[PDB]
A paper describes a structure:
A 3.2 Å resolution structure of [name] bound to target DNA reveals how specific elements of the N-terminal dimerization and [name]+ [name] domains facilitate protein oligomerization to engage and bend a 60 bp duplex while maintaining an [name]-repressed state. In accord with previous low-resolution studies, the cryo-EM structure showed that [name] utilizes its N-terminal domains to form dimers that oligomerize into a clamshell-shaped, two-fold symmetric decamer through ATP-dependent [name]+ domain interactions. That is, the inverted arrangement of two [name]+ domain pentamers, the DNA-binding surfaces of which face one another owing to the molecular two-fold axes of their associated N-terminal domains, sterically prevents the binding of a sixth [name] subunit to the complex in this configuration. In the [name] decamer, eight out of the ten nucleotide-binding sites adopt a canonical [name]+ [name] configuration. Close inspection of the EM map showed clear density maps for ATP in all binding pockets. Exceptions were the two terminal monomers where the nucleotide-binding sites are solvent exposed (the outer dimers are also more flexible). The first 65 residues of [name] are composed of 3 small α-helices, which form the dimerization interface of the protein and connect through an elongated helical extension to the [name]+ domain. Close inspection of the complex revealed the presence of numerous positively charged residues that interact with the target DNA, which partially explained the 30-fold increase in duplex affinity observed for the full-length protein compared with the isolated [name] module (Kd,app of 40 nM versus 1.5 µM, respectively). These amino acids, together with a conserved region of the [name]+ domains known as the initiator-specific motif, form an internal cavity within each [name] dimer that engages DNA primarily through nonspecific contacts to the phosphodiester backbone. The subsequent assembly of [name] dimers into the final decameric state in turn generates a continuous, U-shaped channel that tracks the periodicity of the duplex DNA (about 10.5 bp) and introduces an approximate 180° curve into the target molecule.
Residue numbers in the entry:
A (entry chain C), B (entry chain D), C (entry chain B), D (entry chain A): 1 to 246
The structure:
């Protein structure tokens, strides 16, 4: 009969239940427990494992380069940013408010760290997330258009609830491809948030994309409903370098 | 806590477990046997329900017009066929032996009834089964060819473990399309069984397909490893008509 | 030290040597012959295993549906073909002589069986072989041409030393596509032998291709240097069927 | 039988084993040796030869102009650098720590020699290495991008475990292409070490690349995990010139 139980558990797609079937049976035998409570505990454990696996798969599908979280963020080293606003962002209210989040400032101040923290929080709460750099997004859209399948890649970049665009400005974009970025900003306008991190001021975006009018349209769509953070302070990388030296 | 159990059962894709959770819990409380045996009974009931649903889905996907069984076949009305051979067929040994089944004889003698019985038995033991008429098969193959997707339809007609070709001979096949049939008979040769029901003897197949050489090739391929039944006797439809009149 | 031996054997890409290292060492210790002879035996076994793996890979790339050999061929049941000629073919002299091999006769007389025997014999002696049906070859060439990459598939059909074309005559080839076959016959003309199995006489090939001039050109190119076999006798499939019944 | 052994050894891609086959056979015959130990010795010698050839091939693939090592470096002539730190670097702990190595100072003080020594040490221990000058790297990346194959060259520059950038500052980089260099620093950041030699201070990097912001970002990414050596003293080339004159 035990083998039949194992076979049924494996057939109903309950591997962890089969693995822990003996342990839970021993626990129920040693200590008197109602059947309802036993089943509730077993199903809750199975659901916990399923949710953990789902979160891991989501993190795999979001192409996050290095998992980070706000818990490791030292606001003492970055007094230029009000931690209250960051905590408000972590509420994920902007997702329902359809508001983008624009991080700005010098290199190595936590812009990418904060963006990845927000993306990780969104993933934890079940919000589909996708992380990518501006150069990579533009190149992928250009390649998809060259292959006559731009719509598929546009759906790929528009479906995620939270799209993170990292390092918008370090590498100048090819003007002929700049419009691709606009399309995303145009298709996620009042549909989904965009978490965009950059070191360039808005007025310089025309240089980045090589089209002043297109840059102005992109900025109008992106800044219509968004939260703009202008971070400042010394680079954290240099801080760690000095600490190691000292 | 019970609502949590219901939600978990719904999330685990076990609707019947959620539906019958209360009844089984009450039975276990009133009658205490064991936690292991209680879970065994629950999972066995769930497996039975899932198996029934899968069988129904297979029947729906097998394009069987009506559902028959060997139980309803009265061998007293058709003494010309030995029931022993039919029972041997019902063991589905021909599936492993790659043997084809051919039913021949006048109309209304149970050829299609036996073919559908064999198909239903094959579906019962989990073997994929498909049923189609020769005229419809040829027409669908021609239409797929005209639209440049003959390969997809050929895969559809070759995937099933047991393919039943019914009423091959009442309607003469289009000479420009009869070759399509051969292709199927060529692709399933020594790979999957074919259950073909017809009233025309083998020597007459040349008339049906409009090509003596193609007919001979088809017959040699189909009759290599095959069980040929030449049923006889008066039509059963007329027997029922006489019984109703009398 | 033995672990180092295992690691070195794995690094040199000799898995079988590492796996059988213990057995050969035990044999050498129990039975002493010579270091040179021990290494000779080890290397002979390794070469045999490598040759077997290479033959398996070639068969994977040779597209041989079922493996047959001349040993299982019963010339007593097929006296219409002189076994001496088949043995002469087994020498593979036609490969150097640039001579094709054409089999003709009624269905189910061993034509495909002999063609696959020749193909397997060629594969054994390191010759590249590729087996295909005429209809499938024509379909693949047409699809490649429609994709603008016909020459790639043409090379794929031309690269193998021995190309076997089966079922030429049972299905009429598309007149708009039969020329593709001609191209192969043109490209392998006195370049690499072709083993073609068919049931139609040469004069009828026009009906197969729908063009008398094209059929005549194909016949002239194929028969310029070839060995023609005209087999006769009852189909062996029907003989096996009668034996099973009797 | 000896010819068979030689043929098998050559087929199994063991040239040196066959070359020394007679010598090893004579050594085994003259002095009694267990077969296991004899095979261990033979495989060890083959592995040593393979390792030497692999190291030489890696040296050829990595464009090192002249081969040097630490043993040839005279710390007495360059007291400005502590030998202890160089020896610590030779342990290759930075590879596990993802720490870069920057050499700075006047020309001809051994920066290139030390970089080549570290690269050779990395190659010897089996770590993939690559050497190039900054101008050459920038030009190659620009040419690859102009051909629409920037990703392939980026992989080429990122795949090596230890990348050496020699003479970063002697030749000013084209402002339109400086970003290419950043890409490498952007992709090798926290992934693989970089050994960079320069005669320019960090504050002047903006002049080298012609973009203050890009230079600052490159420096922040490079110095996050790095070991910086400020070498001083007279030029070694001038020292040799004076010694030859005197
Ligand atoms: N306040 C901080 N607390 C903890 N880690 C930090 C902080 N600021 C930066 N870091 C770490 O420093 C490194 C660089 O910071 P980060 O990538 O977030 O900066 P950035 O603004 O995105 O930089 P860039 O412009 O170079 O892309 C990362 O490891 C990041 O985790
Ligand atoms: N011996 C029998 N017992 C029970 N039902 C029978 C029997 N013979 C025939 N029938 C029923 O009579 C009807 C006609 O029989 P069936 O369709 O199997 O005959 P057939 O020879 O395949 O017909 P056709 O040539 O018209 O396709 C069906 O309902 C079949 O179930
Ligand atoms: N002489 C024989 N000895 C053994 N088996 C045979 C012999 N002749 C035919 N067979 C078997 O009969 C079956 C059909 O024969 P084969 O595969 O050679 O096809 P074929 O006659 O070339 O077919 P077609 O004319 O349709 O192309 C195969 O199982 C083959 O092994
Ligand atoms: N301490 C030393 N011991 C041995 N050889 C040395 C030493 N210093 C320099 N050399 C040799 O002097 C020549 C030039 O030195 P090297 O290229 O290493 O210096 P550098 O500072 O990188 O030069 P530059 O900036 O002019 O290109 C090379 O042959 C190097 O091997
Ligand atoms: Mg960043
Ligand atoms: Mg019927
Ligand atoms: Mg054949
Ligand atoms: Mg130098």
């Amino acid at each position: 009969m035990k083998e039949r139980i194992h076979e049924y558990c494996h057939r109903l797609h309950l591997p962890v239940m089969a693995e822990r079937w003996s342990a839970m049976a021993e626990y129920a035998s040693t200590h008197n427990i109602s059947y309802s409570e036993f089943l509730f505990r077993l199903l809750e454990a199975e659901i916990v494992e399923k949710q953990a696996r789902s979160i891991q798969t989501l993190i795999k599908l979001s192409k996050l380069p290095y998992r980070k979280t706000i818990d490791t963020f030292d606001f003492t080293a970055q007094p230029s940013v009000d931690e209250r606003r960051i905590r408000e962002l972590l509420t994920l209210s902007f997702i329902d408010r359809k508001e983008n989040i624009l991080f700005l400032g010098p290199p190595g101040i936590g812009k990418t760290h904060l963006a990845i923290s927000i993306g990780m929080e969104a993933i934890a709460r079940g919000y589909k997330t996708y992380f990518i750099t501006a150069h990579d997004l533009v190149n992928q859209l250009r390649r998809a258009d060259q292959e006559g399948k731009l719509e598929k890649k546009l759906r790929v970049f528009v479906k995620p609830t939270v799209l993170i665009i990292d390092e918008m400005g370090y590498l100048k974009l090819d003007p002929n491809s700049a419009h691709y970025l606009f399309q995303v900003i145009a298709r996620r306008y009042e549909h989904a948030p965009i978490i965009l991190t950059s070191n360039k001021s808005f007025g310089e975006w025309g240089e980045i994309v090589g089209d002043s009018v297109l840059a102005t349209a992109m900025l109008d769509r992106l800044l219509h409903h968004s939260i703009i953070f202008n971070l400042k302070g010394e680079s954290y990388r240099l801080r760690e370098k000095r600490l190691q030296e000292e």
